[PDB]
Design a protein around this ligand. Sequence first.
Ligand SMILES: [Mg+2]
Ligand SMILES: [Mg+2]
Ligand SMILES: [Mg+2]
Ligand SMILES: [Mg+2]
Ligand SMILES: [Mg+2]
Ligand SMILES: [Mg+2]
Ligand SMILES: [Mg+2]
Ligand SMILES: [Mg+2]
Ligand SMILES: [Mg+2]
Ligand SMILES: [Mg+2]
Ligand SMILES: [Mg+2]
Ligand SMILES: [Mg+2]
Ligand SMILES: [Mg+2]
Ligand SMILES: [Mg+2]
Ligand SMILES: [Mg+2]
Ligand SMILES: [Mg+2]
Ligand SMILES: [Mg+2]
Ligand SMILES: [Mg+2]
Ligand SMILES: [Mg+2]
Ligand SMILES: [Mg+2]
Ligand SMILES: [Mg+2]
Ligand SMILES: [Mg+2]
Ligand SMILES: [Mg+2]
Ligand SMILES: [Mg+2]
Ligand SMILES: [Mg+2]
Ligand SMILES: [Mg+2]
Ligand SMILES: [Mg+2]
Ligand SMILES: [Mg+2]
Ligand SMILES: [Mg+2]
Ligand SMILES: [Mg+2]
Ligand SMILES: [Mg+2]
Ligand SMILES: [Mg+2]
Ligand SMILES: [Mg+2]
Ligand SMILES: [Mg+2]
Ligand SMILES: [Mg+2]
Ligand SMILES: [Mg+2]
Ligand SMILES: [Mg+2]
Ligand SMILES: [Mg+2]
Ligand SMILES: [Mg+2]
Ligand SMILES: [Mg+2]
Ligand SMILES: [Mg+2]
Ligand SMILES: [Mg+2]
Ligand SMILES: [Mg+2]
Ligand SMILES: [Mg+2]
Ligand SMILES: [Mg+2]
Ligand SMILES: [Mg+2]
Ligand SMILES: [Mg+2]
Ligand SMILES: [Mg+2]
Ligand SMILES: [Mg+2]
Ligand SMILES: [Mg+2]
Ligand SMILES: [Mg+2]
Ligand SMILES: [Mg+2]
Ligand SMILES: [Mg+2]
Ligand SMILES: [Mg+2]
Ligand SMILES: [Mg+2]
Ligand SMILES: [Mg+2]
Ligand SMILES: [Mg+2]
Ligand SMILES: [Mg+2]
Ligand SMILES: [Mg+2]
Ligand SMILES: [Mg+2]
Ligand SMILES: [Mg+2]
Ligand SMILES: [Mg+2]
Ligand SMILES: [Mg+2]
Ligand SMILES: [Mg+2]
Ligand SMILES: [Mg+2]
Ligand SMILES: [Mg+2]
Ligand SMILES: [Mg+2]
Ligand SMILES: [Mg+2]
Ligand SMILES: [Mg+2]
Ligand SMILES: [Mg+2]
Ligand SMILES: [Mg+2]
Ligand SMILES: [Mg+2]
Ligand SMILES: [Mg+2]
Ligand SMILES: [Mg+2]
Ligand SMILES: [Mg+2]
Ligand SMILES: [Mg+2]
Ligand SMILES: [Mg+2]
Ligand SMILES: [Mg+2]
Ligand SMILES: [Mg+2]
Ligand SMILES: [Mg+2]
Ligand SMILES: [Mg+2]
Ligand SMILES: [Mg+2]
Ligand SMILES: [Mg+2]
Ligand SMILES: [Mg+2]
Ligand SMILES: [Mg+2]
Ligand SMILES: [Mg+2]
Ligand SMILES: [Mg+2]
Ligand SMILES: [Mg+2]
Ligand SMILES: [Mg+2]
Ligand SMILES: [Mg+2]
Ligand SMILES: [Mg+2]
Ligand SMILES: [Mg+2]
Ligand SMILES: [Mg+2]
Ligand SMILES: [Mg+2]
Ligand SMILES: [Mg+2]
Ligand SMILES: [Mg+2]
Ligand SMILES: [Mg+2]
Ligand SMILES: [Mg+2]
Ligand SMILES: [Mg+2]
Ligand SMILES: [Mg+2]
Lengths: 138, 175, 111, 80
Amino acid sequence: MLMPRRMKYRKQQRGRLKGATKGGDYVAFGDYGLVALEPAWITAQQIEAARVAMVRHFRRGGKIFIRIFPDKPYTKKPLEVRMGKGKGNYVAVVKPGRVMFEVAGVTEEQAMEALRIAGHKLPIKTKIVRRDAYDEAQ
Amino acid sequence: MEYRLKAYYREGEKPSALRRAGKLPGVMYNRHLNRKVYVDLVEFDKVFRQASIHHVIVLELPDGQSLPTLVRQVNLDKRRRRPEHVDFFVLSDEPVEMYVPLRFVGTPAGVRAGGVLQEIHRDILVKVSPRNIPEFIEVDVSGLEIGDSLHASDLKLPPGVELAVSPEETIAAVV
Amino acid sequence: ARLTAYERRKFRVRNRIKRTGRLRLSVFRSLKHIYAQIIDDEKGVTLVSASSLALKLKGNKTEVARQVGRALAEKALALGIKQVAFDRGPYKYHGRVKALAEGAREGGLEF
Amino acid sequence: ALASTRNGRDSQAKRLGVKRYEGQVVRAGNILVRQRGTRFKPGKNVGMGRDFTLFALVDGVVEFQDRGRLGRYVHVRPLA
RNA sequence: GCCCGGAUAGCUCAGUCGGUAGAGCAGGGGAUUGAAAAUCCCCGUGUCCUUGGUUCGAUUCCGAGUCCGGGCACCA
RNA sequence: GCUGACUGGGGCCUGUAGAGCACUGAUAGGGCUAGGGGGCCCACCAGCCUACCAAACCCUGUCAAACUCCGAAGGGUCCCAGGUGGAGCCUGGGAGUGAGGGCGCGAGCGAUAACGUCCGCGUCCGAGCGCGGGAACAACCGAGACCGCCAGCUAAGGCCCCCAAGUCUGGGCUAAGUGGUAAAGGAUGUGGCGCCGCGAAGACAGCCAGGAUGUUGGCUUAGAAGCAGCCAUCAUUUAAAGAGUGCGUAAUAGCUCACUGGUCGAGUGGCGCCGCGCCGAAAAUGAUCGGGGCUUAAGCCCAGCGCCGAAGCUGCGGGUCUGG
RNA sequence: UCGCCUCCUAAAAGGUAACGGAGGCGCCCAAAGGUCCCCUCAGGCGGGACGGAAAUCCGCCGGAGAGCGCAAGGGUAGAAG
RNA sequence: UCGAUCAACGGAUAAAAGUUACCCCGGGGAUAACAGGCUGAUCUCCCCCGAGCGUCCACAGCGGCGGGGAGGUUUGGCACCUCGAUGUCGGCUCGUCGCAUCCUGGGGCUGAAGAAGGUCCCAAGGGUUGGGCUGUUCGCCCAUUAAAGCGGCACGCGAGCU
RNA sequence: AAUCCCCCGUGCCCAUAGCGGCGUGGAACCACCCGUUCCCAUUCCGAACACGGAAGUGAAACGCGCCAGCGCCGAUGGUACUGGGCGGGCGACCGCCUGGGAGAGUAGGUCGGUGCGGGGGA
Ligand SMILES: [Mg+2]
Ligand SMILES: [Mg+2]
Ligand SMILES: [Mg+2]
Ligand SMILES: [Mg+2]
Ligand SMILES: [Mg+2]
Ligand SMILES: [Mg+2]
Ligand SMILES: [Mg+2]
Ligand SMILES: [Mg+2]
Ligand SMILES: [Mg+2]
Ligand SMILES: [Mg+2]
Ligand SMILES: [Mg+2]
Ligand SMILES: [Mg+2]
Ligand SMILES: [Mg+2]
Ligand SMILES: [Mg+2]
Ligand SMILES: [Mg+2]
Ligand SMILES: [Mg+2]
Ligand SMILES: [Mg+2]
Ligand SMILES: [Mg+2]
Ligand SMILES: [Mg+2]
Ligand SMILES: [Mg+2]
Ligand SMILES: [Mg+2]
Ligand SMILES: [Mg+2]
Ligand SMILES: [Mg+2]
Ligand SMILES: [Mg+2]
Ligand SMILES: [Mg+2]
Ligand SMILES: [Mg+2]
Ligand SMILES: [Mg+2]
Ligand SMILES: [Mg+2]
Ligand SMILES: [Mg+2]
Ligand SMILES: [Mg+2]
Ligand SMILES: [Mg+2]
Ligand SMILES: [Mg+2]
Ligand SMILES: [Mg+2]
Ligand SMILES: [Mg+2]
Ligand SMILES: [Mg+2]
Ligand SMILES: [Mg+2]
Ligand SMILES: [Mg+2]
Ligand SMILES: [Mg+2]
Ligand SMILES: [Mg+2]
Ligand SMILES: [Mg+2]
Ligand SMILES: [Mg+2]
Ligand SMILES: [Mg+2]
Ligand SMILES: [Mg+2]
Ligand SMILES: [Mg+2]
Ligand SMILES: [Mg+2]
Ligand SMILES: [Mg+2]
Ligand SMILES: [Mg+2]
Ligand SMILES: [Mg+2]
Ligand SMILES: [Mg+2]
Ligand SMILES: [Mg+2]
Ligand SMILES: [Mg+2]
Ligand SMILES: [Mg+2]
Ligand SMILES: [Mg+2]
Ligand SMILES: [Mg+2]
Ligand SMILES: [Mg+2]
Ligand SMILES: [Mg+2]
Ligand SMILES: [Mg+2]
Ligand SMILES: [Mg+2]
Ligand SMILES: [Mg+2]
Ligand SMILES: [Mg+2]
Ligand SMILES: [Mg+2]
Ligand SMILES: [Mg+2]
Ligand SMILES: [Mg+2]
Ligand SMILES: [Mg+2]
Ligand SMILES: [Mg+2]
Ligand SMILES: [Mg+2]
Ligand SMILES: [Mg+2]
Ligand SMILES: [Mg+2]
Ligand SMILES: [Mg+2]
Ligand SMILES: [Mg+2]
Ligand SMILES: [Mg+2]
Ligand SMILES: [Mg+2]
Ligand SMILES: [Mg+2]
Ligand SMILES: [Mg+2]
Ligand SMILES: [Mg+2]
Ligand SMILES: [Mg+2]
Ligand SMILES: [Mg+2]
Ligand SMILES: [Mg+2]
Ligand SMILES: [Mg+2]
Ligand SMILES: [Mg+2]
Ligand SMILES: [Mg+2]
Ligand SMILES: [Mg+2]
Ligand SMILES: [Mg+2]
Ligand SMILES: [Mg+2]
Ligand SMILES: [Mg+2]
Ligand SMILES: [Mg+2]
Ligand SMILES: [Mg+2]
Ligand SMILES: [Mg+2]
Ligand SMILES: [Mg+2]
Ligand SMILES: [Mg+2]
Ligand SMILES: [Mg+2]
Ligand SMILES: [Mg+2]
Ligand SMILES: [Mg+2]
Ligand SMILES: [Mg+2]
Ligand SMILES: [Mg+2]
Ligand SMILES: [Mg+2]
Ligand SMILES: [Mg+2]
Ligand SMILES: [Mg+2]
Ligand SMILES: [Mg+2]
Ligand SMILES: [Mg+2]
């Protein structure tokens, strides 16, 4: 689905969405990227919604990178009220300026119209990008 | 093929202002120098899209000297993804490490049209005497078959100068 | 293998001695000679010295040693030094090292 | 168990740490540092009790010493 | 309307080592017998409930949507 | 009886924010490789191929309250100075309190719900439901009310009328009554900054003008001879029409475009950015930005100058306590 | 659920709540105690009868990832093993 | 020096469980049940995207996976006025409003020949039946109908009735 | 005697002293080395520790150099965060002032420095 195997701890505190993406952010694997303009918990099921929209969009062809991963467990109570925490029930924290997704090996006009679909499945505003000198060398 | 920009100096003059000003803070340095400079953003941009830490940029700037720089850093701030500052490395004649682009030459040359092409590096890091700087590298290897990993020194090595290696890594492959 | 047995026991016995905080009567012994050097730490400083080298004596290495002890006491006691602690370094207290130490009383002592 | 709550414990805080800082005047007996491992070793005129606890041996002032991979050190300088 | 299950030749029901679906019970033929029944052999048809996905590959892994079985919530 | 909060200098203590991946774990893409998933040649040790399993290892790329190779701002404490304060310390007499709340910041629980809940540091209400602003309103802004005054200056907020003071001066924006409101998402609204393609070898708009050959394309067919259909979409002859984009359809007749000449005559089409706006936009008694009303403003952004404005500050007089 | 220990929450002093997230104790040892002396791990690769992923042996590499009676933390081979 | 799961672990007694719709007093809106309020997970309705089904396909009619909201009618969360009292479901009577429209009026599109439908837009003037069953609200069913609309008003309305 | 250089001790800074490669040293120091009678040793072994030695060797170790492949250290500039002071946003969050200011990374650095004492040369 997308999810770790093996966790150290089952549940973990919410924390803030403060700041800028802190890495990720420079477009390392592909010809075109999708970058986050807003912070959000992006869900294993939103990610896979986007991934499939793109493969469906081209031919089973192309190449797709993803590059954000849902390692943060997301609890919810049932309709109860208050005794303990839990349960269940996975997100990836995503700050502004991060490259998620990022396709390659496809025509610009394909990638861009697929990346546009892809971001319609996301809770945040997004930006399509290309690739650069600015994405350096390393 | 050959590139120059401009450059100016600065001492005080807070970066935020300069950056509001259409200009682009940066620094000039090398073993014998370190100096505070700025440039025009819109000007710099056009050049850097081209040069891109691959070709040499000769600056200009007042005095007027004209200084043979390699760009060795660009900090783009992550929110707007747009350069906030630039490192300009000035050459002198002592060997210096750097990034050379890569010319992949051929047809798929076996399993042609085709397997999958898979270029694993658009660059290589190489120690080079500034004087002779091999502005690209033709790499063909018409052997070019399914599954292999070409290492390093199997590259042309345009005449001037040696790898900054590692000699064993992954350049391309077909599958 | 890092940091040998020799250098462990070396450190081991020094450290213990160095806590009590007396002057240190340190003993080097080569296969040929035996030297002894009385140190004050925290000044990192040597005060009295005695060697089978600078005394140029020979024959029966143990008996040679008893002498460089008396040699040390005598020179040392002359500066006021009476109490110290026997370093014994990385050497079993025995034989040549024992002998220098029991030759180092008659003079400053407790060994 | 799992749900109701299996958690809920914690122990009392141990009020651990440094109790005298550099150049504070102390007297024989004053404990200088309260600590779990050997996180500071005893220095000049400084004892260590069985719970790893460091005290002044003599009246004086406390100096701190960072000896690199020899760890950190607390001494008391007399003029007691 | 809600959370959970089941669809497999002709009917009944298997089938987690992801990697070539078999056993019965029908049906046809054989051995058996005086002829059958029983019993033993042997036989074939599921494009294996549609559709997106993973995977080189899914009836065998995932998630929905259906035709149909279970447990669920009007109000004082 | 100078030691106080606060402040300056100096030392020491620390492991948060940020960041990092060296540890513990998680983790995307690739490489190289143990064991095998066994395709199998075995069914002798063999045994090779792996677009599946895979440790470690290299490369790229990330994540963590209970990870840290790192690590600020600040915070604590001691010394030395300033600091005479309804400050400080010592002994003793009298209490009351031990339901707190809002808000800001930092966390947890909760649903990145609650005028939710629980801690931390601040504040204010409590007890300042006294005063001014916010239409009205404990805790938001302003400000700490001893008494009096038909005197002055200011704070916040204001200066078109209700309503005290500008229908004040300059520059730009907006045509929705936006202002006077609510998102994804959308859109030749409108104004600026920019970049890219095409264009007086005369482009974009129109208009005048050509509207393929072998050939039905081989396929398929009563026929698709592009348009009821799956396609060798290939040789040619041209300044120049795809065996044909669409209406047509008794397959063909008739028809249009692409793609070209030509007429004219200066810009045209694409992208990105910022400002203001527009759609998205459905609730229950009678409506409304507090109201009237406002459109080069009485709205929004920029610069300015006056003024109005409190129990704050001043001026004058008085009261009481404390000090001298 | 109620006392005790470890970690986090805990906002880099101490301290700090919740029917917040996770675990442990109610023992044990006459040696697992005192001292003196000596010795140094785990792991990996290579070699070696029965010996196999591992018994024991030999080589090299291995600053601590092992050990320290039991949870966790801190500490620790210049020993606390 | 010993006897403590005095473990509700600062340890009332050496010695102790239940029930009350037969109940009582003192208090509390410090605290539950009703209603309101905040909230809006859940619920109802929109909207974005647009795999896909629809012979072909402009989405005629559908619409996966995901995304953003509106409303405040549900079930809840919270515990804020009210416990020196805010009478609770349902019916009846009497209405009034909202519009997310059931009918009638006017529209666009259609996979609209006509007639008849489908879907969406405008529109709140008026209308919106009678019965069997159950306390029922709902719902099912009979017979009709232009239709047999969904909500709010303390789940409107007990100093109006039952 | 000071000064310098080499060795031997022994401190200190705590990797800029480390790993690896290379080279170099025996007169003197030092080590390995000769032996196991004696003191003293090995859960077996003079391996180690110990003694009595002095024929040989700088092979090992140690010391001294030189190499930047690794390791270690590491600016300046710019950001992040932030004391204090202000704004903006339904929210999540964001910006301005003033003061402090990393981490990663880039440039470079580095094959140590040094105190006391001896022995020997100066
Ligand atoms: Mg990074
Ligand atoms: Mg969520
Ligand atoms: Mg409850
Ligand atoms: Mg979006
Ligand atoms: Mg604790
Ligand atoms: Mg027969
Ligand atoms: Mg028969
Ligand atoms: Mg004073
Ligand atoms: Mg201080
Ligand atoms: Mg963090
Ligand atoms: Mg890691
Ligand atoms: Mg942390
Ligand atoms: Mg550092
Ligand atoms: Mg003072
Ligand atoms: Mg007082
Ligand atoms: Mg008192
Ligand atoms: Mg109480
Ligand atoms: Mg209380
Ligand atoms: Mg409280
Ligand atoms: Mg704020
Ligand atoms: Mg509250
Ligand atoms: Mg709140
Ligand atoms: Mg408060
Ligand atoms: Mg009160
Ligand atoms: Mg007050
Ligand atoms: Mg009032
Ligand atoms: Mg007021
Ligand atoms: Mg008022
Ligand atoms: Mg008011
Ligand atoms: Mg007030
Ligand atoms: Mg007053
Ligand atoms: Mg007004
Ligand atoms: Mg007026
Ligand atoms: Mg005017
Ligand atoms: Mg208006
Ligand atoms: Mg309005
Ligand atoms: Mg104007
Ligand atoms: Mg103004
Ligand atoms: Mg005035
Ligand atoms: Mg007066
Ligand atoms: Mg007074
Ligand atoms: Mg910790
Ligand atoms: Mg703390
Ligand atoms: Mg703190
Ligand atoms: Mg603290
Ligand atoms: Mg327990
Ligand atoms: Mg081993
Ligand atoms: Mg082995
Ligand atoms: Mg350990
Ligand atoms: Mg432990
Ligand atoms: Mg342990
Ligand atoms: Mg530990
Ligand atoms: Mg109790
Ligand atoms: Mg108690
Ligand atoms: Mg207690
Ligand atoms: Mg009792
Ligand atoms: Mg009773
Ligand atoms: Mg009864
Ligand atoms: Mg009775
Ligand atoms: Mg009674
Ligand atoms: Mg009563
Ligand atoms: Mg009611
Ligand atoms: Mg209620
Ligand atoms: Mg009420
Ligand atoms: Mg809502
Ligand atoms: Mg709402
Ligand atoms: Mg809508
Ligand atoms: Mg409610
Ligand atoms: Mg209440
Ligand atoms: Mg409360
Ligand atoms: Mg009541
Ligand atoms: Mg009353
Ligand atoms: Mg009604
Ligand atoms: Mg309507
Ligand atoms: Mg109608
Ligand atoms: Mg009609
Ligand atoms: Mg119609
Ligand atoms: Mg009709
Ligand atoms: Mg009507
Ligand atoms: Mg009506
Ligand atoms: Mg009847
Ligand atoms: Mg009835
Ligand atoms: Mg019913
Ligand atoms: Mg009826
Ligand atoms: Mg209700
Ligand atoms: Mg009612
Ligand atoms: Mg009544
Ligand atoms: Mg009444
Ligand atoms: Mg009434
Ligand atoms: Mg270090
Ligand atoms: Mg020699
Ligand atoms: Mg010689
Ligand atoms: Mg040698
Ligand atoms: Mg650095
Ligand atoms: Mg800096
Ligand atoms: Mg600040
Ligand atoms: Mg730095
Ligand atoms: Mg080095
Ligand atoms: Mg030295
Ligand atoms: Mg000398």
